[PDB]
Amino acid sequence: SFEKTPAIKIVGNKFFDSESGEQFFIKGIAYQLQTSYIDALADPKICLRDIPFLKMLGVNTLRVYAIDPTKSHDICMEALSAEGMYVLLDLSEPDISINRENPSWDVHIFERYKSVIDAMSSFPNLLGYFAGNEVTNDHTNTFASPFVKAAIRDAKEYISHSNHRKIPVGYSTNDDAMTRDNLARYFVCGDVKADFYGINMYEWCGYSTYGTSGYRERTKEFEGYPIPVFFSEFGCNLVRPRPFTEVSALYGNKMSSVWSGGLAYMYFEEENEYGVVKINDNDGVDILPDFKNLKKEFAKADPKGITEEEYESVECPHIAVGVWEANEKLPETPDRSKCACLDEILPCEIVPFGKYEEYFSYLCSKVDCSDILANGKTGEYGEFSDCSVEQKLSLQLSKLYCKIGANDRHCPLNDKNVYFNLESLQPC
Ligand SMILES: OC[C@H]1O[C@@H](O[C@@H]2[C@@H](O)[C@H](O[C@@H]3[C@@H](O)[C@H](n4cc(COCc5ccc6ccccc6c5)nn4)O[C@H](CO)[C@H]3O)O[C@H](CO)[C@H]2O)[C@H](O)[C@@H](O)[C@@H]1O
């Protein structure tokens, strides 16, 4: 039974409980242990240990940054539902993410996003998905953002064409002064838009105030933003134990008319001093001084919202060199069929199983690698720029093979990982 968690839906720039019609405010915490990552929601002995404490905290939402899609999550997701708890979930994972230094939106990242969506979308208490987390994070990598927007578009379209509930897809951003206005506007401009927007917000440290923290300014900054907005992280730890007095302001009347709440960072203590509990060496939960403060603050918080009943495409920011360099034109939807046909017909392949940059530098000096390049500044995306890194390398190696012209099945690069594709000879 998921009775205690009706699906949340989005109307205008607010969240609403789809049964009651009452505005939904996130009172949350990040929940992630440090496959490279650990999936606490796929291990009942972990998630069932912590839910009682999460209940004590009084949270109604968790943020999870990575799950393993090959594992079951029904037991943990049901247990969360039985305590009124929802999940915000990143589609990416540290080893499969849009690389902000060398961005791409390709079939390999798309397949990861699809796997998570297919693993998690049957749960009514899945609040939403993030299509990226702080990808662009300063003025030197703004050109990463068109790739995120494409991913937002393709994730929404995949969900739309599936049989699943239409779970919203949004974005989570950082708080860099030079980029934050342009980023906010970019992700709701043009024909593609985030469904919701999270900011990792650390401006309020210790016993600050609404005016002095910068919260007042951020609030008036985001007034009228056409999609729901919230703190996907908060909790500056400059002063400890964290008083979490930012919570009184966030759910106060001035802020609750704008923001849909926030999630504290985070549950587990991991030698970074952001936890509210520490797991001891007997695998038990030790409560830390921050805990009571977060608990009492969430407990006093009583956001007053409006009910669902009582409740011009935005222009994209112009380009300026060194300031904003995200083109409005987005890359195409990654095409697994087109790309999988490269695996079938190319004479020379490379197995994934790095030295990619060396190999690229080498091969792209001998043949024209335009067709695998993707430029988020200029909005120029090559025909095979959506394929995987291996397929792109294989394409260029095969072009060099054909240009040399020996036809002796002898791929013009030495590496254990290079092989001649016998399937290429069999008469996409
Ligand atoms: O797409 C953008 C980039 O994504 C990286 O992966 C991603 C990864 O970095 C990110 O990591 C988050 C990590 O961002 C998040 N987090 C929270 C914090 C606390 O920050 C407090 C803080 C610290 C210093 C500050 C300094 C100034 C101002 C404020 C500050 C705040 N630190 N980490 O904790 C999560 C674990 O608890 C962790 O999963 O999770 C995602 C999803 O799974 C991967 O997509 C990739 O690895 C990069 O290759 C890629 O470029």
How many other CB atoms are found less than 10 A from the CB of residue 302? 9
Identify the CA nearest to 384 among candidates 340, 327, 322, 325: 340
Q: Is any atom of ligand 1 closer than 6 Å to the C-beta of 99? A: yes
Whether 360 and 369 have beta carbons less than 8 Å apart is answered as yes
Burial-class residue 329 by CB neighbours within 10 Å (0-12, 13-18, 19+): middle
Please report the DSSP string for 115-151 in residue order: HHHHHHTT-TTEEEEEEEESSS-STT-GGGHHHHHHH
Q: How many CA atoms lie within 13 A of 114 on its CB side?
A: 14
Give the residue numbers annotated as catalytic, written as ranges. 134, 233
Which technique? X-ray
Residue with tokens 């239409």: 166
How many angstroms separate the Cα of 182 from the Cα of each of 175, 224, 245, 259, 294?
12, 16, 29, 19, 32
Whether 201 and 231 have beta carbons less than 8 Å apart is answered as yes
Give the H or E element holding residue 396: helix 389-404
The answer to whether the annotation marks 375 as part of a ligand binding site is no
Provide the 8-state DSSP code for 423: G
| Strand-pair partners of 64 | 89
Q: Is the preceding omega at residue 334 within 30 degrees of 0, hence cis?
A: no
Structure tokens at 139: 């003025």
Mutate to test the pocket of ligand 1, among 37, 89, 92 (most ligand atoms within 8 A of CB): 92
Residues written for the chain: 428
d(C-alpha 55, C-alpha 27), whole Å:
12
Cα radius of gyration (the chain): 24
Q: 8-300 has which fold?
A: TIM Barrel (3.20.20)
Q: Which amino acid appears at position 127 of this protein?
A: L
Question: 4: CA distance to ligand 1 center in Å?
Answer: 31
d(C-alpha 148, C-alpha 100), whole Å:
10
Contact residues for 414 (Cβ-Cβ < 8 A; gap 6+): none
> Could you tell me the resolution of this structure in angstroms?
1.9
d(C-alpha 161, C-alpha 58), whole Å:
36
Q: How many CA atoms lie within 13 A of 138 on its CB side?
A: 2
Whether 106 and 388 have beta carbons less than 8 Å apart is answered as yes
The answer to whether the annotation marks 227 as part of a ligand binding site is no
d(C-alpha 135, C-alpha 148), whole Å:
8
Contact residues for 265 (Cβ-Cβ < 8 A; gap 6+): 29, 30, 200, 233, 234, 235, 274
The answer to whether the annotation marks 97 as part of a ligand binding site is yes
Query: With breaks defined as C to next N over 2.5 Å, after which residues does the chain break?
Result: 34, 311, 353, 427
Q: Is any atom of ligand 1 closer than 6 Å to the C-beta of 146? A: no
